[PDB]
Design a protein around this nucleic acid. Structure first.
Ligand SMILES: [Zn+2]
Ligand SMILES: [Zn+2]
Ligand SMILES: [Zn+2]
Lengths: 200, 193, 187, 72
RNA sequence: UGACUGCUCCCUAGCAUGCUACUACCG
RNA sequence: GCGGUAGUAGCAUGCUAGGGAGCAG
């Protein structure tokens, strides 16, 4: 329950399909849902069909039912679509402002952070959008650098000479001091104080 | 069949009412595939290159080099064409890879162990004894060891880099799946044709 | 709903209704037209009452099947957890003295209250005050349950290691007092 | 007044429990005794003395900022 | 870490029964 | 111009399920 990211409006809705779960008010969250593939938004409880064994997450297919949210195939007779009238149902559904400027958010949310357009949009947008873009960029970087396994060293060699390998199909990580490895060595159970290293 | 001759190295006295049945096991579901698809590596990776090389088998250095470029490989040779000691000489050419030996028969491991003790060290090699006639002078419960000898029937979960499966003719796809599920490695070596 | 034969009948009924409205047909033709659409509505009432009921029944059955599958998964998980608990607590039994007392029984059956009293390699003593400490756990070694126990660790209710020198008459009020002394079997 | 001091004892023991006072067996036992005696007290003199004794536990720690919480 | 039983309120969902509501079939 | 039979929907009753909560021994 906080201010919206793209609209600075009080909201309890986090876009579940996004990375950092940004706070979005009803209108702008609906715009993000209909203009991208981010068909999952969170609340005090996640927007998902609470009927057991169901796998729908799309807010468009999700309808408010009883004390929980359901889908057309699992809705009670008293059914209420979550995303309707240009806004997804939730708290502050009446005290809402919204913003017509939702194209930038929909573009930056689905970007892989591999094109210069993402950097241009991050440098040219609202301050809240710029901060969200920076946070998501850091999250993507740390998830791409953690998308591999544990580099295992099986032998010990002389000083300043180690044959470090990579994973199966993993590209070569930056050999410069751009990434400073800060792990935690495990003796038998606990991971603590591997030390500070700088690969060169 | 030689009133049936038994090919056992031990002795036993039978009693009244004792019967022998063709006891089989329960085939568990097979998850692991036979082999992962191959891919051409640019460099010799996955195995640690050591600055000292073995000149004991000059006609196998090229074979080891070519194996180090392929994910899974198999050499087509007649029986006795270095079939029993190819992996043994590989474990000494590069003493930096977890070499795991396995066979489709428990009685065929004697041929493997005949010269392995002369070539590979005896002290640093051991065999896990489950709770049919093999060496018992080894050290049991040696989970962390460079060289591991065991059978698919009682093979616990472990990891390695190079796995050699001798006598590939008598092993079926189920046996291959069992070998790949009990032991998980990025390389698989098949000896035979 | 959208692929039933009644849809074509309804379309034909609507076309006939439009033709009658434009031409201005007789009352008998209008009644016959109504008897067609209205009993095609009878057919579709059934297709929206028995088929819709079958869809609800299928959804209910699928939900029950999902619940049963989740129950079986929970049963498997609980079975594995209980089996692992039994197998990891059996391995701490020290079956040497356990077999020594079991085989010494009349028929291999013993009361449960004596197994920890005879074959437990670790004794934990909870002491509420120093007056009971000096009687029971005096010194670095003490005798209890027809055996000799040597203290390896003493802790308080805060689970803080307290040394034997700290258990004094004057130092008693400076310690949390359910003192838990752990001892090992002597031999 | 008496109900007021008993409720203050309740909230004070609540904040003490939130401050991991129960990690100290002696301190938590003393706090529990004081809190239960305040609730069982019949006069607002013994209860207030025990309330001062219990509040001394909160004031004895550095885990609570006393200046910030006194906003008046 | 969160027992057994009993009674009572509130919300929702689906199903059995009393109506009400209109189209036409049938004589 | 007829009794409807039916039907299917606002309304009512009940029965069940699910959730939240209160008291009692
Ligand atoms: Zn917004
Ligand atoms: Zn999103
Ligand atoms: Zn559903």
């Amino acid at each position: 329950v906080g201010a919206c990211v793209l609209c600075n409006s009080q909201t309890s809705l986090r876009c579940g399909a996004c990375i950092r779960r940004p706070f979005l008010c009803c209108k702008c969250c609906y715009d993000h849902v209909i203009s991208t593939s981010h068909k999952l938004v969170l609340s005090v409880n996640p927007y998902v069909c609470n009927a057991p064994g169901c796998d729908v997450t799309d807010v468009t297919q999700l309808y408010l039912g009883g004390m929980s949210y359901y889908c057309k195939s699992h809705k009670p007779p008293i059914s209420f679509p979550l995303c309707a009238n240009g806004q997804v149902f939730g708290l502050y559904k009446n005290t809402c402002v919204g913003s017509d400027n939702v194209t930038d958010f929909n573009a930056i949310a689905t970007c892989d952070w591999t094109n210069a357009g993402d950097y241009i949009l991050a440098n040219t947008c609202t301050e809240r959008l710029k901060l969200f873009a920076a946070e998501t960029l850091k999250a993507t970087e740390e998830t791409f650098k953690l998308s591999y396994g544990i580099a295992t060293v099986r032998e010990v060699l002389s000083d300043r000479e180690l044959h470090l390998s990579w994973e199966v199909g993993k590209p070569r990580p930056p050999l410069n001091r751009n990434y400073v490895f800060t792990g935690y060595r495990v003796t038998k159970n606990s991971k603590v104080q591997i030390g500070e290293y700088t690969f060169e | 069949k030689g009133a049936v001759v038994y090919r056992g190295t031990t002795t036993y006295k039978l009693n009244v009412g004792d019967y022998f049945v063709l006891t089989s096991h329960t085939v568990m579901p097979l998850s692991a595939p036979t082999l992962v698809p191959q891919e051409h590596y640019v460099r010799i990776t996955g195995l640690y290159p050591t600055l000292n090389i073995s000149d004991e088998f000059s006609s196998n250095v090229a074979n080891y080099q070519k194996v180090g470029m392929q994910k899974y490989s198999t050499l087509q040779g007649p029986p006795g064409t270095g079939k029993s000691h190819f992996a043994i000489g590989l474990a000494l050419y590069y003493p930096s890879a977890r070499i795991v030996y396995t066979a489709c028969s428990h009685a065929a491991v004697d041929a493997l162990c005949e010269k392995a003790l002369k070539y590979l060290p005896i002290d640093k090699c051991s065999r896990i004894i489950p709770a049919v006639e093999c060496f018992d002078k080894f050290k049991v419960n040696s989970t962390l060891e460079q060289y591991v000898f065991c059978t698919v029937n009682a093979l616990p979960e472990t990891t390695a880099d190079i796995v050699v499966f001798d006598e590939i003719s008598m092993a079926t796809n189920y046996d291959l799946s069992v070998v790949n599920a009990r032991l998980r490695a990025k390389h698989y070596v098949y000896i035979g044709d | 709903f959208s692929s039933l034969p009644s849809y074509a009948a309804f379309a034909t009924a609507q076309e006939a209704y439009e033709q009658a409205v434009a031409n201005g047909d007789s009352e008998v033709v209008l009644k016959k037209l109504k008897k067609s659409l209205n009993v095609a509505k009878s057919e579709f009432d059934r297709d929206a009452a028995m088929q819709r009921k079958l869809e609800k029944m299928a959804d209910q059955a699928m939900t029950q099947m999902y619940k049963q599958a989740r129950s079986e998964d929970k049963r498997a998980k609980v079975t594995s957890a209980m089996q692992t608990m039994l197998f990891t607590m059996l391995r701490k039994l020290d079956n040497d003295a356990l077999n020594n007392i079991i085989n010494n029984a009349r028929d291999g059956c013993v009361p449960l209250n004596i197994i920890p009293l005879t074959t437990a390699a670790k004794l934990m003593v909870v002491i509420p005050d120093y007056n009971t400490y000096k009687n029971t756990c005096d010194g670095t070694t003490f005798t209890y349950a027809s055996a000799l126990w040597e203290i390896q660790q003493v802790v308080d209710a805060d689970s803080k290691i307290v040394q034997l020198s700290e258990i004094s008459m004057d130092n008693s009020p400076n310690l949390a007092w359910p003192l838990i002394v752990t001892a090992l079997r002597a031999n | 007044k008496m109900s007021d001091v008993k409720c203050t004892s309740v909230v004070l023991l609540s904040v003490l429990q939130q401050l991991r006072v129960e990690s100290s067996s002696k301190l938590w036992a003393q706090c529990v005794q004081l809190h239960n005696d305040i609730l069982l007290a019949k006069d607002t003199t013994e209860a207030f003395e025990k309330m001062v004794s219990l509040l001394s536990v909160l004031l004895s720690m550095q885990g609570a900022v006393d200046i910030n919480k006194l906003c008046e």
